[PDB]
Design an enzyme around this catalytic site. Structure first.
Site, PDB file in Angstrom:
ATOM      1  N   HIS A 154      98.753   0.907  56.500  1.00  0.00           N
ATOM      2  CA  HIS A 154     100.176   1.230  56.602  1.00  0.00           C
ATOM      3  C   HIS A 154     100.785   0.851  57.947  1.00  0.00           C
ATOM      4  O   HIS A 154     102.003   0.960  58.102  1.00  0.00           O
ATOM      5  CB  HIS A 154     100.487   2.687  56.209  1.00  0.00           C
ATOM      6  N   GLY A 168     100.642   9.377  65.593  1.00  0.00           N
ATOM      7  CA  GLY A 168      99.834   8.392  66.284  1.00  0.00           C
ATOM      8  C   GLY A 168      98.341   8.566  66.110  1.00  0.00           C
ATOM      9  O   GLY A 168      97.563   7.786  66.685  1.00  0.00           O
ATOM     10  N   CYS A 220      96.608   8.225  63.280  1.00  0.00           N
ATOM     11  CA  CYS A 220      96.010   7.429  62.215  1.00  0.00           C
ATOM     12  C   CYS A 220      95.011   6.419  62.766  1.00  0.00           C
ATOM     13  O   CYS A 220      95.194   5.853  63.848  1.00  0.00           O
ATOM     14  CB  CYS A 220      97.090   6.704  61.423  1.00  0.00           C
TER      15      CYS A 220
HETATM   16  C1  LIG Z   1      99.568   8.106  61.285  1.00  0.00           C
HETATM   17  O1  LIG Z   1     100.341   6.923  61.135  1.00  0.00           O
HETATM   18  C2  LIG Z   1     100.292   9.307  60.705  1.00  0.00           C
HETATM   19  C3  LIG Z   1      99.543  10.613  60.986  1.00  0.00           C
HETATM   20  C4  LIG Z   1     100.352  11.870  60.657  1.00  0.00           C
HETATM   21  C5  LIG Z   1     101.615  12.076  61.497  1.00  0.00           C
HETATM   22  C6  LIG Z   1     101.774  13.588  61.509  1.00  0.00           C
HETATM   23  N1  LIG Z   1     100.398  14.055  61.405  1.00  0.00           N
HETATM   24  C7  LIG Z   1      99.565  13.149  60.901  1.00  0.00           C
HETATM   25  O2  LIG Z   1      98.361  13.309  60.661  1.00  0.00           O
HETATM   26  N2  LIG Z   1     100.500   9.119  59.268  1.00  0.00           N
HETATM   27  C8  LIG Z   1     101.727   8.997  58.742  1.00  0.00           C
HETATM   28  O3  LIG Z   1     102.754   9.015  59.430  1.00  0.00           O
HETATM   29  C9  LIG Z   1     101.823   8.868  57.222  1.00  0.00           C
HETATM   30  C10 LIG Z   1     102.224   7.443  56.833  1.00  0.00           C
HETATM   31  C11 LIG Z   1     102.291   7.171  55.334  1.00  0.00           C
HETATM   32  C12 LIG Z   1     102.777   5.757  55.047  1.00  0.00           C
HETATM   33  C13 LIG Z   1     100.942   7.417  54.678  1.00  0.00           C
HETATM   34  N3  LIG Z   1     102.771   9.854  56.739  1.00  0.00           N
HETATM   35  C14 LIG Z   1     102.566  11.157  57.004  1.00  0.00           C
HETATM   36  O4  LIG Z   1     101.550  11.614  57.494  1.00  0.00           O
HETATM   37  O5  LIG Z   1     103.624  11.907  56.633  1.00  0.00           O
HETATM   38  C15 LIG Z   1     103.511  13.315  56.959  1.00  0.00           C
HETATM   39  C16 LIG Z   1     104.846  14.014  56.753  1.00  0.00           C
HETATM   40  C17 LIG Z   1     104.841  15.455  57.272  1.00  0.00           C
HETATM   41  C18 LIG Z   1     104.372  16.259  56.082  1.00  0.00           C
HETATM   42  C19 LIG Z   1     104.897  15.476  54.910  1.00  0.00           C
HETATM   43  O6  LIG Z   1     105.054  15.880  53.758  1.00  0.00           O
HETATM   44  N4  LIG Z   1     105.145  14.225  55.331  1.00  0.00           N
HETATM   45  C20 LIG Z   1     105.633  13.149  54.484  1.00  0.00           C
HETATM   46  C21 LIG Z   1     107.097  12.818  54.734  1.00  0.00           C
HETATM   47  C22 LIG Z   1     107.594  11.770  53.749  1.00  0.00           C
HETATM   48  C23 LIG Z   1     109.067  11.427  53.981  1.00  0.00           C
HETATM   49  C24 LIG Z   1     109.898  12.666  53.952  1.00  0.00           C
HETATM   50  F1  LIG Z   1     111.219  12.342  54.193  1.00  0.00           F
HETATM   51  F2  LIG Z   1     109.891  13.190  52.673  1.00  0.00           F
HETATM   52  C25 LIG Z   1     109.449  13.715  54.916  1.00  0.00           C
HETATM   53  C26 LIG Z   1     107.978  14.058  54.677  1.00  0.00           C
END
Ligand SMILES: *[C@@H](O)[C@H](C[C@@H]1CCNC1=O)NC(=O)[C@H](CC(C)C)NC(=O)OC[C@@H]1CCC(=O)N1CC1CCC(F)(F)CC1
Lengths: 303, 303
Positions: free
Chosen positions: B40, B142, B144
C-alpha cells in the site's frame, strides 16, 4: 485492554556489548564498552567466600591471567583490573567495535528501563522493569543472569542504569548502577536481606491518569486543587510514595498536553484514594497502573 | 519471577530500512538484496479506497521507490509483488542478514514485534496471534512494515508484517508471503474482525507459571473431564482445549505435579466465580499471551 503495554527498547546496541566473564568455574555476564569490561565483583568469589566475602583481599590474590573474558568463543585478553564499589572493571586489549554512544546514569525510583537478560554472554530476552520505591525490581532472572544490564535509549545514546547482582527472599531482584553502587540498602553477600515494604509509584499513577485523559476517559477530574505537602501527607496514608519536585517536573509535558495542572491532577488522585473508584474504571481497569512513567505514556500516546 | 519477554531484536534491527513512494513513508525489511514492504506504499488518496494494485504497480518505475538504510540510499533495480507485499530488488546485499525463514503462524502462537518508524527501530514487545487473526499491538502512524518474529538458536523466523489498525484499536497484517491473517484487506476502510476468544491452552500455561512462582490460591481439590471443561470454556468464549494441548502442557504438569485436567478444574472455577479481588502473577485478568513453550523457555534460561 487499555491500549498500553510494557514496551522495551530495541536491544541490538546492548547485545553488541555483552560478553562472559569467568573466574574458575563461576561464569557471569559482562558489559564491554571501549576497552573496558564491567561485571559484578562477586565473579571472584567461591561458594565459601560468598557468605561474608573480603573483596579487597580476594582481589589482591587475583591477577589479570585469572580472568577469562569471552565474546562468544573468542577470548578477550585482560590487561588490567580494578574494583569500583561492587563492580569489577577489566581493561582489555581490544576496543569493542560495536560500542554505541553511551552514558552511565543512576535512575530514581519509579523510572523504567529495559533489561536484556543474558546467560553465558548470550541474550535470552528483553523486557521492561520499573525501579520500585524500595529499590528492587520485579525481574525474570535465573542462575547465571548476573551482569545482565538495564538501559534506556535516547536518540542513538544508550544510558546504562542497572547491572544485576542478586535475588531477594521475596523473589524480587537487586543490583547496582554501572559505577557499582547498589540501588537501596543491599550488599553483595550470600545472606538473607529484606526489601523494605514497597509503596505505589505515585508519579506513574499520575502519568496513567494523564494517559486516560488523553484518551478521553476523564470522569475522575474534579474542580479542586491541593498543595504538594497536603497531597504527600494524604498519599502516605494509602501507601503511596510522596512526590518530589523532580516528579512534578517530569509530569510537565503531560500537564501541558492536557492543560491539567499537576496539583489539580493530584487533587483528583486524592479523591480517588479517599473515595475509591466505586465500580468505575479508568482505561478499562478498576486498578491504577504504576509502572508506566510519563515518558512511557508520551511514547505510546504520541510517538 | 515470570515476565512477558520479547526476543532480543538485534538481528532484526540490522534489517530495517525506510521505503518512500510519493508522500508515503513506511518501513521495509532488507534481507540479502531484497527489501520487503507493504504494497500500500504505492497508493494515493484517490487509490486507497479500491486500489487495483496490479494496475497501480505497472505504472511505477524503480526510481519512484526511495529506500534508505541509515544515511545511505539503496538503488532499486527491480520490483515485484507477492500478494500484499512488495519486493524491491536493490543493488547491494545486506551483510547483516541473519539466518532466517518465513513462517505462517497459527492462532494462539506468540511472537515478538519490532515496532519501527522511518526505518528506525523504536520498541520491542511480545504479542499473540489472536483466534480472530488480529493482534493486540502498539502501532502508530508510520509503523507499517514493522515485523514480528521468533528466534530459534541463530535463525530468525519472520511471521508478521504490519499493515493496518482496526476501529477497535487492534491490528492486522500479513505473513512474509503477503497473505493477510484474517479476513482483512489492504484498502482504506474501517474493518471489523470476527468475535475474539481467549486462548485457553495459554491461560493454563500461565496458571502453571504462577504455581512455579509460588502462587497457588486458585488451585482446588477437584478435577474435570476434557469434554465437560470444553463445554464450559466455549460458554465463556474460550477456545476448546485439544488432546494435543493437554500433551503440550505435559512438561509443566510434570514439573508442578498438577494434572492438566486438575488445572482445568481450577480454571473452570475462575471462570464461574471470578478472581474476587485477588491477582495472579500481579494480573487482575487471566493472561492468554504466554504459550506453554514461552513458560518453559523462560523457566529454563534458553538463549
Ligand atoms: C501504516 O501505513 C499504517 C499503520 C496504522 C496507522 C495507525 N495505526 C496503524 O497501525 N496503516 C494504514 O494507514 C492503513 C492503510 C490501508 C491502505 C491498509 N490504514 C489504517 O491502518 O487505517 C486505520 C484507521 C483507524 C482505524 C480505522 O478504522 N481506520 C481506517 C480508516 C479508513 C478511512 C476512514 F475515513 F473511514 C477512517 C478510518
Amino acid at each position: 485492554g487499555s491500549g498500553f503495554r510494557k514496551m522495551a527498547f530495541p536491544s541490538g546496541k546492548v547485545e553488541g556489548c555483552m560478553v562472559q566473564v569467568t573466574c574458575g568455574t563461576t561464569t557471569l555476564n559482562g558489559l564491554w564498552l571501549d576497552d573496558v569490561v564491567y561485571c559484578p565483583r562477586h565473579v571472584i568469589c567461591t561458594s565459601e567466600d560468598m557468605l561474608n566475602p573480603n573483596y579487597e583481599d580476594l582481589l589482591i590474590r587475583k591477577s589479570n591471567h585469572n580472568f577469562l573474558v569471552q565474546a562468544g568463543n573468542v577470548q578477550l585478553r585482560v590487561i588490567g583490573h580494578s574494583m569500583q564499589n561492587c563492580v569489577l572493571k577489566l581493561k582489555v586489549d581490544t576496543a569493542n567495535p560495536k560500542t554505541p554512544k553511551y552514558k552511565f546514569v543512576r535512575i530514581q525510583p519509579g523510572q523504567t528501563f529495559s533489561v536484556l537478560a543474558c546467560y553465558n554472554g548470550s541474550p535470552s530476552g528483553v523486557y521492561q522493569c520499573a525501579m520500585r520505591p524500595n529499590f528492587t525490581i520485579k525481574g525474570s532472572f535465573l542462575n547465571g543472569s548476573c551482569g545482565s544490564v538495564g538501559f534506556n535509549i535516547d536518540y542513538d545514546c544508550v544510558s546504562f542504569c542497572y547491572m544485576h547482582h542478586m535475588e531477594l527472599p521475596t523473589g524480587v531482584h537487586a543490583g547496582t548502577d554501572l559505577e557499582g553502587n547498589f540501588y537501596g540498602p543491599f550488599v553483595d553477600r550470600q545472606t538473607a536481606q529484606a526489601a523494605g515494604t514497597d509503596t505505589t509509584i505515585t508519579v506513574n499513577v499520575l502519568a496513567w491518569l494523564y494517559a486516560a485523559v488523553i484518551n478521553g476517559d476523564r470522569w475522575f477530574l474534579n474542580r479542586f486543587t491541593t498543595t504538594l505537602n497536603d497531597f504527600n501527607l494524604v498519599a502516605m496514608k494509602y501507601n503511596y510514595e510522596p512526590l518530589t519536585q523532580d516528579h512534578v517536573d517530569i509530569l510537565g509535558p503531560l500537564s501541558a498536553q492536557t492543560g491539567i495542572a499537576v496539583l489539580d491532577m493530584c487533587a483528583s488522585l486524592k479523591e480517588l484514594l479517599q473515595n475509591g473508584m466505586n465500580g468505575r474504571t479508568i482505561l478499562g481497569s478498576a486498578l491504577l497502573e504504576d509502572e508506566f512513567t510519563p515518558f512511557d505514556v508520551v511514547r505510546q500516546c504520541s510517538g
